[PDB]
Design an enzyme around this catalytic site. Structure first.
Site, short mmCIF file in Angstrom:
data_model
loop_
_atom_site.label_atom_id
_atom_site.label_comp_id
_atom_site.label_asym_id
_atom_site.label_seq_id
_atom_site.Cartn_x
_atom_site.Cartn_y
_atom_site.Cartn_z
N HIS A 110 -2.37 6.83 5.53
CA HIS A 110 -3.40 7.68 4.93
C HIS A 110 -3.22 9.14 5.35
O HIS A 110 -3.29 10.04 4.53
CB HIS A 110 -4.78 7.18 5.34
N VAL A 117 -0.02 2.15 11.76
CA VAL A 117 0.77 2.40 10.57
C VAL A 117 -0.17 2.67 9.41
O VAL A 117 0.03 3.62 8.65
CB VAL A 117 1.67 1.20 10.27
N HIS A 118 -1.19 1.84 9.27
CA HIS A 118 -2.15 2.01 8.19
C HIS A 118 -2.77 3.41 8.26
O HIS A 118 -2.87 4.11 7.25
CB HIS A 118 -3.25 0.96 8.30
N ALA A 119 -3.18 3.82 9.46
CA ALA A 119 -3.78 5.14 9.65
C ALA A 119 -2.78 6.24 9.33
O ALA A 119 -3.12 7.25 8.71
CB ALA A 119 -4.27 5.30 11.09
N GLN A 159 0.84 -1.19 0.00
CA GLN A 159 0.00 0.00 0.00
C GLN A 159 0.88 1.25 0.00
O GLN A 159 0.58 2.23 -0.67
CB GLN A 159 -0.91 -0.02 1.24
#
Lengths: 103, 103, 103
Positions: B80, B75-77, A78
């Site tokens: 973004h 990490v994902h947040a 991602q």
């Protein structure tokens, strides 16, 4: 893992190629070649779209058990895809500016 | 997890909305509407600021045990939010250029 | 972990400084100082290059056991470095536009 690991490499390479094409598209604009820039941008997007589609399947059909979240592996993919897509979108804007300037 | 998972979705949506507003702000500039662009940028930043504040609490008060690092989820947040903030900052620069050009 | 954790902090700080220098470089361009902008960009890149080199060693020599992938920790570092490098590259393009725009 087997595929997932090999798939990520493909995604990373694809994302990298996408950016490469995008930068090249910008370079064309600097030479005053809007036609080639547009063609390069269009192809860049298609590469990203296919890459994004693969990632979507991963994010949606990845998680073996319940949760939809992501995985260490997916996050890495991602990161490259998100960076590439953003780069490409911004580069598109930059190219449009070159057109407004003249060249 | 319960909140953390639902919170991330909110952050992802918020980050996405932030970018959406930013791109829209740029579009206004292309139409020669600097006033609307500025208003849109200001709101975009506020959305990000609130989002960043929530992430900060997470990063600072997340890790139940010792370590401050981050988590798969965070990490994902961050990805973004980092992408959105960067996009928005660059878009701001792009808008300023439109103003210098004229329109 | 000990070093890895402390190393990440250094990388995050370095990445942040890199961006800071890049934005400052852009600011110089706005003042019509192409010379200072170029000098700032050159230094910004060197900071990133050293940071990237450290990350490469991590990604290559990190994973104690087999797999080359990445780790929760590395991903976080990559996020900052990837964002900073991209920001810096785009900022470079933005600066070039200022030069074309006269000033």
């Amino acid at each position: 893992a087997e595929e997932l690991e090999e798939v990520v490499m493909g995604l990373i390479i694809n994302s990298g190629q996408a950016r490469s094409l995008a930068y090249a598209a910008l370079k064309q604009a600097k030479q005053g070649d809007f036609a080639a820039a547009k063609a390069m941008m269009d192809q860049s997007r298609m590469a990203l779209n296919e890459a994004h589609l693969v990632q979507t399947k991963l994010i949606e059909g990845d998680a073996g058990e319940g949760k939809m979240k992501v995985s260490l592996v997916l996050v890495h993919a991602q990161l490259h895809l998100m960076t590439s897509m953003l780069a490409r979108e911004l580069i598109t804007e930059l190219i449009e500016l070159h057109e407004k300037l003249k060249a």
